[PDB]
Curated annotation (Swiss-Prot):
Coverage span on the entire protein: 9 to 146 of 180
Domain of life (superkingdom): Eukaryota
Binding site for Mg(2+) 1: 42, 62
Named cofactor requirement(s): Mg(2+); Mn(2+)
GO cellular component, one term: cytoplasm
Similarity section: Belongs to the Nudix hydrolase family. DIPP subfamily.
Lineage: Eukaryota, Metazoa, Chordata, Craniata, Vertebrata
GO molecular function, one term: inositol-5-diphosphate-1,3,4,6-tetrakisphosphate diphosphatase activity
Binding site for substrate: 2, 10-12, 31-33, 81-83, 100, 118
Main localization (coarse): cytoplasm
Active-site annotation: 61 (proton acceptor)
Protein name: Diphosphoinositol polyphosphate phosphohydrolase 2
Role played: Cleaves the beta-phosphate from diphosphoinositol polyphosphates such as PP-InsP5 (diphosphoinositol pentakisphosphate), PP-InsP4 (diphosphoinositol tetrakisphosphate) and [PP]2-InsP4 (bisdiphosphoinositol tetrakisphosphate), suggesting that it may play a role in signal transduction.
Nudix hydrolase domain ranges (all copies): 10-129
Location(s) in or outside the cell: Cytoplasm
Length: 131
């Protein structure tokens, strides 16, 4: 089920999954329906979920990884779709074998990939450089 805030935005969560604490390489994935499109893993929050819980669940489901949840990068508001997405960072500790594709990308290459594939997700990684 979907959940909304009092301003009518759909609540979502997403996560930049990093290979290490360096935050140099991020895991991108592609979905089942659009396998040639790289995206950052994320999705809708469920009704009684906290944003970090959603984030952790989404990376397990859409990326097949587990790790240590880090800071809230920010809340990204997509006015074209009326989304508000809590984007976290996470340090990957386990890659679940037998889990669609998933690849490590240096952040700069990830931004270039996403600028074509999914511009909104590119903004997530740009926020790392922004500060």
């Amino acid at each position: 089920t979907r959940t909304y805030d009092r301003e009518g935005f759909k609540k979502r969560a997403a996560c930049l999954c990093f290979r290490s604490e360096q935050e140099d390489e991020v895991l991108l994935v592609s979905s089942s329906r659009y396998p040639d499109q790289w995206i950052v893993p994320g999705g809708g929050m469920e009704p009684e979920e906290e944003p970090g819980g959603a984030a952790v669940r989404e990376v397990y489901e859409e990326a097949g990884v587990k790790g240590k949840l880090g800071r809230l990068l920010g809340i990204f508001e997509n006015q074209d779709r009326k989304h508000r997405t809590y984007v976290y960072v996470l340090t990957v500790t386990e890659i679940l074998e037998d889990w669609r594709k998933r690849e490590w990308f240096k952040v700069e290459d990830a931004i270039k990939v996403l600028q074509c594939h999914k511009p909104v997700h590119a903004e997530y990684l740009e926020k790392l450089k922004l500060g």
